[PDB]
Design a protein around this ligand. Structure first.
Ligand SMILES: [Cl-]
Ligand SMILES: [Cl-]
Lengths: 73, 152, 69
């Protein structure tokens, strides 16, 4: 079973390319990019204004997630 | 991000309020292009042995400001039971009694109060606190000598 | 696990902080660096300031679960 901080706030699945917003919130890249294009330019959780270019790769989470794969699925 | 921008807008707001209504004997503001790093000036209060001296302080705001206190230290040497040779200030507002409702203006007022009225019973420098409590004539003498040697 | 460790502290972090370069540091270390070494990222060397630091909330949840082990 998966922990929650590994799963996407939007995707509800294991994150594959985690980005973190200026609020400190981490999303899977495709899902947050799809939210920004279809819903609006705001953080799904904090609601503060958000654009695609402000997403930051959460590099430490990417290796946390990779280590989960290397243990199970 | 959100947090840093929030801190910046509040530091900015506190700077503006302070320049619009300066204290007569004090000042504080960013050293250059860095809003998180300020310098302050305190005139030694008349009716105290720091009379006539000028004291400079550095202020570093945290990224969590206003939800963490600023870091404040003297860069001018001063003889005081709650201020040490590194310039560190033992003062409640800067430690356990911080509140996000307080401001740099209130930090400066509190430090001035501290210079007029030490807290020797909770000392940072115990020997100075002892001379303060047992021999105020000598404390005043040495404090004025330090003011003349280091702040005039 | 090297990834729970800071890129300055080289120790497990209590307050993870990420930079626009995407590197996570323990807060105290990165802030001391910025204030007293220079306004730059210690690993990428790109320009960095205190207000760009972003809490790495996901990484904090990771450390919390490892602590409970
Ligand atoms: Cl997501
Ligand atoms: Cl670090």
């Amino acid at each position: 079973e998966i922990p929650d901080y590994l799963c996407g706030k939007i995707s509800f699945e294991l994150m594959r390319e985690p980005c973190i917003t200026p609020s400190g919130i981490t999303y899977d890249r495709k899902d947050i990019e799809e939210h920004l294009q279809r819903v609006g330019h705001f953080d799904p959780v904090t609601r503060s204004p958000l654009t695609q270019d402000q997403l930051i790769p959460n590099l430490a989470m990417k290796e946390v997630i990779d280590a989960f794969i290397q243990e199970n699925g | 991000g959100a947090m840093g921008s929030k801190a910046l807008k509040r530091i900015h707001k506190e700077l503006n309020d302070l320049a619009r209504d300066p204290p007569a004997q004090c000042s504080a503001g960013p050293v250059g292009d860095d809003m998180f790093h300020w310098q302050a000036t305190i005139m030694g209060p008349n009716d105290s042995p720091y009379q006539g001296g000028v004291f400079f302080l550095t202020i570093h705001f945290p990224t969590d400001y206003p939800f963490k206190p600023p870091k404040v230290a003297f860069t001018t040497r001063i003889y005081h039971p709650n201020i040490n040779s590194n310039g560190s200030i033992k003062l409640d507002i800067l430690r356990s009694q911080w509140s996000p409702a307080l401001t740099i203006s209130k930090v400066l007022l509190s430090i001035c109060s501290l210079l007029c009225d030490p807290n020797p019973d909770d000392p940072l420098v115990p020997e100075i606190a002892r001379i303060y409590k047992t021999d105020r004539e000598k404390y005043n003498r040495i404090a004025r000598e330090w003011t003349q040697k280091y702040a005039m």
